[PDB]
Design an enzyme around this catalytic site. Sequence first.
Site, PDB file in Angstrom:
ATOM      1  N   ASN B 156       0.813  -1.213   0.000  1.00  0.00           N
ATOM      2  CA  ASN B 156       0.000   0.000   0.000  1.00  0.00           C
ATOM      3  C   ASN B 156       0.849   1.266   0.000  1.00  0.00           C
ATOM      4  OD1 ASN B 156      -2.417   1.493   0.067  1.00  0.00           O
ATOM      5  ND2 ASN B 156      -2.306   1.659   2.301  1.00  0.00           N
ATOM      6  N   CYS B 157       1.609   1.498   1.065  1.00  0.00           N
ATOM      7  CA  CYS B 157       2.327   2.758   1.206  1.00  0.00           C
ATOM      8  C   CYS B 157       3.454   2.576   2.208  1.00  0.00           C
ATOM      9  CB  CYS B 157       1.386   3.883   1.636  1.00  0.00           C
ATOM     10  SG  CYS B 157       0.032   3.336   2.686  1.00  0.00           S
ATOM     11  N   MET B 365       1.638   8.271   6.093  1.00  0.00           N
ATOM     12  CA  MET B 365       1.832   7.798   4.734  1.00  0.00           C
ATOM     13  C   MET B 365       0.489   7.702   4.028  1.00  0.00           C
ATOM     14  SD  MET B 365       2.536   3.752   5.381  1.00  0.00           S
ATOM     15  CE  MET B 365       4.068   3.842   6.296  1.00  0.00           C
ATOM     16  N   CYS B 367      -2.935   8.742   2.045  1.00  0.00           N
ATOM     17  CA  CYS B 367      -3.937   9.767   2.295  1.00  0.00           C
ATOM     18  C   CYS B 367      -3.957  10.136   3.772  1.00  0.00           C
ATOM     19  CB  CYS B 367      -5.319   9.297   1.838  1.00  0.00           C
ATOM     20  SG  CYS B 367      -5.317   8.238   0.375  1.00  0.00           S
ATOM     21  N   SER B 369      -3.166   7.273   6.272  1.00  0.00           N
ATOM     22  CA  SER B 369      -2.769   6.087   7.015  1.00  0.00           C
ATOM     23  C   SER B 369      -1.573   6.386   7.909  1.00  0.00           C
ATOM     24  CB  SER B 369      -2.448   4.948   6.054  1.00  0.00           C
ATOM     25  OG  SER B 369      -1.089   4.972   5.671  1.00  0.00           O
ATOM     26  N   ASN B 388       3.020  -0.098   4.947  1.00  0.00           N
ATOM     27  CA  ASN B 388       1.705  -0.682   5.153  1.00  0.00           C
ATOM     28  C   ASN B 388       1.502  -1.849   4.193  1.00  0.00           C
ATOM     29  OD1 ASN B 388      -1.371  -0.939   4.852  1.00  0.00           O
ATOM     30  ND2 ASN B 388      -1.162   0.468   6.585  1.00  0.00           N
ATOM     31  N   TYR B 524      -8.663   1.713  11.239  1.00  0.00           N
ATOM     32  CA  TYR B 524      -8.345   2.629  10.154  1.00  0.00           C
ATOM     33  C   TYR B 524      -9.624   3.277   9.658  1.00  0.00           C
ATOM     34  CZ  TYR B 524      -6.505   4.248   5.643  1.00  0.00           C
ATOM     35  OH  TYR B 524      -6.133   5.007   4.561  1.00  0.00           O
ATOM     36  N   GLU B 529     -12.141   6.574  -1.567  1.00  0.00           N
ATOM     37  CA  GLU B 529     -11.673   6.427  -2.938  1.00  0.00           C
ATOM     38  C   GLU B 529     -12.875   6.279  -3.855  1.00  0.00           C
ATOM     39  OE1 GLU B 529     -10.415   2.551  -3.601  1.00  0.00           O
ATOM     40  OE2 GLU B 529      -9.899   2.797  -5.719  1.00  0.00           O
ATOM     41  N   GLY B 664      -8.791  13.169   1.013  1.00  0.00           N
ATOM     42  CA  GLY B 664      -7.518  13.718   1.432  1.00  0.00           C
ATOM     43  C   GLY B 664      -6.838  14.557   0.371  1.00  0.00           C
TER      44      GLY B 664
END
Lengths: 699, 699
Positions: B156-157, B365, B367, B369, B388, B524, B529, B664
């Site tokens: 993910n990020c 990291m 939007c 998270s 992540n 979370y 999205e 975000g």
Amino acid sequence: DIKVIKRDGRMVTFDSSKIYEAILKASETITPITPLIETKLEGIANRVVAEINDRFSHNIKIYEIQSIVEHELLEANEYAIAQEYINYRTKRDFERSQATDINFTISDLYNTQRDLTAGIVGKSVGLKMLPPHVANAHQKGDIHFHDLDYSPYTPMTNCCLIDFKGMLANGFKIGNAEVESPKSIQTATAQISQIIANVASSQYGGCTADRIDEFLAPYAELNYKKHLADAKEWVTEEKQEDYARAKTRKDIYDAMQSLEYEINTLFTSNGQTPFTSLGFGLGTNWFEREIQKAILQVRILGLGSEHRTAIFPKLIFTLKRGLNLEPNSPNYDIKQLALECATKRMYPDVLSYDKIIELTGSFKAPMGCRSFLQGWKDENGVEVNSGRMNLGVVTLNLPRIALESKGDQDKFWEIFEERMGIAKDALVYRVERVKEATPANAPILYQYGAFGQRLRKCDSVDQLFKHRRATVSLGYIGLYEVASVFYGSDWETNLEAKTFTLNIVKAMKNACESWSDEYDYHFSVYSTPSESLTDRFCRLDTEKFGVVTDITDKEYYTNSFHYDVRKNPTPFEKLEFEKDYPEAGATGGFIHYCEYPVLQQNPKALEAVWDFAYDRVGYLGTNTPIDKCYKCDFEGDFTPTERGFMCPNCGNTDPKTVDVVKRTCGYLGNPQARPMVKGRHKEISARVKHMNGSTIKYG
Amino acid sequence: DIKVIKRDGRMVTFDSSKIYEAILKASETITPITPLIETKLEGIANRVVAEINDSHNIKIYEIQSIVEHELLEANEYAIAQEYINYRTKRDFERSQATDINFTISDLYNTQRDLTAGIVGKSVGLKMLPPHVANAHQKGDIHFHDLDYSPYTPMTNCCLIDFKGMLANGFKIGNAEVESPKSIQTATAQISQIIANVASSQYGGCTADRIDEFLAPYAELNYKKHLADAKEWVTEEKQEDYARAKTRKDIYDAMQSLEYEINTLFTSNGQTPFTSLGFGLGTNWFEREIQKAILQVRILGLGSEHRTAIFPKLIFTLKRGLNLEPNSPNYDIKQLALECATKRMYPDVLSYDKIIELTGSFKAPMGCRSFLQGWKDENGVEVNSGRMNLGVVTLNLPRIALESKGDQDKFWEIFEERMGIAKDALVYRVERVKEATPANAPILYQYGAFGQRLRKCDSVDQLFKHRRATVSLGYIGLYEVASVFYGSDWETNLEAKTFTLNIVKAMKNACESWSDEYDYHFSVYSTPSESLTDRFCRLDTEKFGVVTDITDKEYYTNSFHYDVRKNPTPFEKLEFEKDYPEAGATGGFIHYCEYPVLQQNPKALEAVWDFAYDRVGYLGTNTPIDKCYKCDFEGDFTPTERGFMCPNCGNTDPKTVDVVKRTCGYLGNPQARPMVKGRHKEISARVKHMNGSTIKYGGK
Ligand SMILES: Nc1ncnc2c1ncn2[C@@H]1O[C@H](COP(=O)(O)OP(=O)(O)OP(=O)(O)O)[C@@H](O)[C@H]1O
Ligand SMILES: Nc1ncnc2c1ncn2[C@@H]1O[C@H](COP(=O)(O)OP(=O)(O)OP(=O)(O)O)[C@@H](O)[C@H]1O
Ligand SMILES: Nc1ncnc2c1ncn2[C@@H]1O[C@H](COP(=O)(O)OP(=O)(O)OP(=O)(O)O)[C@@H](O)[C@H]1O
Ligand SMILES: Nc1ncnc2c1ncn2[C@@H]1O[C@H](COP(=O)(O)OP(=O)(O)OP(=O)(O)O)[C@@H](O)[C@H]1O
Ligand SMILES: Cc1cn([C@H]2C[C@H](O)[C@@H](COP(=O)(O)OP(=O)(O)OP(=O)(O)O)O2)c(=O)[nH]c1=O
Ligand SMILES: Cc1cn([C@H]2C[C@H](O)[C@@H](COP(=O)(O)OP(=O)(O)OP(=O)(O)O)O2)c(=O)[nH]c1=O
Ligand SMILES: [Mg+2]
Ligand SMILES: [Mg+2]
Ligand SMILES: [Mg+2]
Ligand SMILES: [Mg+2]
Ligand SMILES: [Zn+2]
């Protein structure tokens, strides 16, 4: 007099030999030759043709031909043949139609797999979208369509030579933000790289910056003026100007450094790096000289802390008599630097200014792998050389045309004319499909003057390419194998075979001229490079025609019209012999490679070859052995093996520590991190040195 | 205590109510509801459950057979056959998901991105475990970005360890490059690094404390300028000169970075999500870098000075450094405030509140998270270098609707969905663990995740011991609260206790899972999205229109206050501070809409100061739209599917500039219009402080 309509729709001719050969293959499928059967098959073949010309008279479809042949051969008490005939028919049809997107692929990069899947689905959709006969011929490999992964699924465009002058003079729009003329040279090269990125994202081919020095000079002048103003503000009264000079020079270097790294770490939607190129060599004033010096210096210095040679951009170095050809001319230092770069790294190429102008039509850097365009004074009359494109290419099989004839010239020409008919149909379909691209669809190329003009959203796209502004190329390959199968392996000594090749190329050129005059788009015969298509070509050819001497046993097809790589003649006679092939009328694209040994200590030989080659043929490439093994520290050439390379001293093959680069396509590549097809591997292994000398540098 | 295996793999407990409900629903489609008919169906269902109780682990196909046979015995044909046909219709639709999907303004690179996405989605749905697949397709949960994963083992990020790469060097493409020697090269390296990272992970990207690690290279540039000015200028102003020059250089470097983010187009064709974090400037160089970044953001992009939708800017507020008027960095905050009122960015992050909430301070990291404090084997805290592994979102409002106003069953079904989500998380992390470092060498074996690995070693050693994280998402706390305790529940206290109980149960489940599987699982808040569109559409289709639940055709994001009423920002923050401190730590952000804050940022400064102690993350939504035809600044009136200037009405992206914060990252609707699941919510967003939203009319 009768004519046959085909499963595709081509009004092909009618004969009696082809059916005989079909039954012979059908019989041999299971039964042996059995002279009785071999001889009896003539009987029912003649029975079949008797049935067709007695029953039908004018237009026969394939359906009745199939029905008649099976019905007639059944009564031969030869059920072991009809069943196999139907077996082959059904199996082919199933295998041909089992080409849908349901294809299963259940150590490589991540984006590359996604784009591979996208290309697979695009290929399926396109082959479902192509006109029937062209698609069928491509499937059997009669003609090789090009880039099925991108066209005609989407209205893509093959390769365009960008007009950076219009960009940097008027400004443009990239992504979300528009841009105004640059105020320095570092920003200039930065946005040049960005434009390269976006254009390469919005197409599937080359990206050539022609005459980079000429349009980069004014911005270097702007930078020098700013530095001079700052110097007046701060530096002492005695030595202002020199400051500027020195600083300006550094800036130039810095700018070019950015370029040499910006488009080296750039991956499009395709994981493969887009194919790019830079051109220079027409510098007069001080700034152009400095920019050429800087480009050559950053090239020779290499990339990375390991001093690894660079692969992109493609570098050319135009040569003009009276400017950079002779020691008296005020550019010999630039030529010396470029020549040192040539002897150290396999770059750059040369452009014979005078002869390329005379032969090609004007002076235009090789757009893309090798496609040169044609002069085109505009509506206002001023010749425009920046902003042209290339709507597509497609290979037409020469060697199969030759080898199907079986030693007869007369059959050759009629099969050639029929193929050319199919190629014309394919060309027309491709250009018509491209003509259906809305400008708003890809604004980077149309809406903001990438092709030389700016068009509003409502407008169409024909105005950009009409009136012979764009080019579509038709392609060929194999000239050597054609001549060998027709006149023996050693045919260069004689002249009749060479006249045969000249005549066939001339016939191709005349056909393109007629097509261009008819459809108003320029059509040119173009020597298609063998990136990996030669492997598919050879594999299909050996599957269809078995194994034959000197034509297929090498598992590859000689690219275009070049000399046989197995032979080792001197470069001088090579250019002397090849000087007429593109002169005759095949100027679409050309590249002559003269093989060298390691001349890092003797680049004077390379200088002599380049000089002698000025008046003979324009393009010129160099193959010097420059690979290196980092673990045992060796430089020179690597002995090829079965499916890779290895350093003769040790054997390390891991690409993490050995840098080998071979001129695989028209652009060189790394045959260690991207294992190509078997055919290119075998062809590279076969290349033979063309000038005796030492090869190993330091074991 | 009777167990039934569901269709795929679930051992859900047996009930008789759902059986009646199913029969009633099967009756509804043709037979109109009437007391006699529904009583008849109830009798039939009682007979069915009686037959069921007439060994304790029954299949599902048996239940379907039972209901068919009993409904036939009920001497009614319409409902039974309709039930069967509904089953076949659903199953056919359950299987209709195959690559055969035919998708036969939309820029070139996209169409193929979309096709690759649909192909990957189909393969992944056919690949992942069955029960969670059914849960996802039925709308119970949402699996995030099914196109990229689990077709390829993506991530993910992350916080790329920029310090490690820029210190020890790294390999990109073909070049292994060591540490830079100037800030321009440093930021070019950063841009290339992030550009090549984004081609190996679906989610966003970010860098934290950019100034803190970029200070040494600014110092190096200043040192080089000073040394070069040692002999080239007068002895008195030498140092002064260097300062000025270096300052401009810094600006230039940062300028480049900004544009080099705007021109990023990966295989997706959408700019990768990217965040920049700073605010810990201590010495002069870090202050200058912060000033440069803020200046290059306020100045805008292009000649039109259009705002930058990317990258994300995060500014950290620390007490005793940049809070009080007497602090040594108040001018930096003044510049930041001006930038925040003139353009959307940057956001804020209190040092103390963040370090208390999530262990140790670290910029988020993606939007929104976030992470949790981690220490390695050597007892050294590290934040940059951890990653992540994606989210899966639950659906609280569906649970609330299914509860039918009943508290007690709500927690049972919630626990069931929680277990389903655990299975999903476990499968996803296991699939990620199946990757190999050689897949994306930049992302894995070259410092992007901290430790440097080898080919022969796996990747699990980089993720165990709670280094990575697998976040699990939630959405629609306001929806469930509204269904349960009425529409206006804000003033009530019991409902707040209920929703915080939901969050607390979520935190406890996550903590237990993390303790068991050795990977840090976390709660979370999902960025919208596309989840609002799909969730609202599915819920409207199934459960029908419900007041203040689906009539707004939008779902409230996370714990946020109702978007249809306007409280004062201070009370919004005091109400919302409870949610993330109670356990909603994995990700959060507090929107705070204001009118045009030009000519007076004092209100913005006041709310920032008030939000220091209360919450950690806060964002500003001042209207910043501009129209160029009539030269208007302010806000635009939402319409059925877009926006326009209230004075004239032009709406094309080439001449208007409308930007509204979604998920975000800002994004501009005119370029890419989002689906009509969010566009009906931004239109529903109500200003949160009285004041004019206009700035200037035109004609
Ligand atoms: N020149 C020809 N004219 C007419 N019939 C021919 C000719 N050459 C071969 N045939 C006959 O055509 C039959 C059909 O071959 P096939 O089944 O491939 O059909 P087709 O129409 O040629 O399809 P395709 O173009 O896909 O090869 C052969 O079995 C042969 O008897
Ligand atoms: N083992 C065999 N190999 C080749 N052909 C076979 C075999 N067994 C049966 N055949 C028959 O011979 C045909 C020869 O192939 P093909 O379709 O290309 O011939 P053609 O029609 O004469 O060629 P074209 O399509 O170019 O006109 C097969 O299509 C099939 O009908
Ligand atoms: N809680 C339950 N326990 C057992 N059977 C149930 C329950 N709820 C409904 N059923 C019965 O299960 C039958 C089968 O439903 P369906 O055809 O959707 O199969 P399924 O196994 O539920 O599949 P899916 O999970 O895809 O919905 C329904 O018609 C209903 O009578
Ligand atoms: N018009 C209709 N609307 C809804 N359900 C219908 C209709 N007609 C027949 N049915 C039957 O009622 C079932 C209700 O959906 P479903 O099977 O998902 O219920 P369930 O088994 O109680 O739920 P779950 O599968 O989530 O446990 C349908 O699957 C089908 O068997
Ligand atoms: C660095 C950079 C600049 N630009 C654009 C932004 C501007 O329109 C343009 C001109 O930029 P610059 O040449 O930097 O001009 P400038 O106006 O900033 O002036 P200065 O000489 O003081 O630097 O180049 C890009 O498009 N991409 C980039 O990566
Ligand atoms: C311009 C550029 C450089 N680099 C790398 C190449 C080098 O390894 C590293 C340092 O670049 P430089 O600091 O420019 O290296 P240099 O040897 O040219 O030194 P100087 O600037 O003093 O002349 O940055 C990139 O990785 N990407 C880029 O776009
Ligand atoms: Mg045939
Ligand atoms: Mg440098
Ligand atoms: Mg069900
Ligand atoms: Mg500038
Ligand atoms: Zn070696």
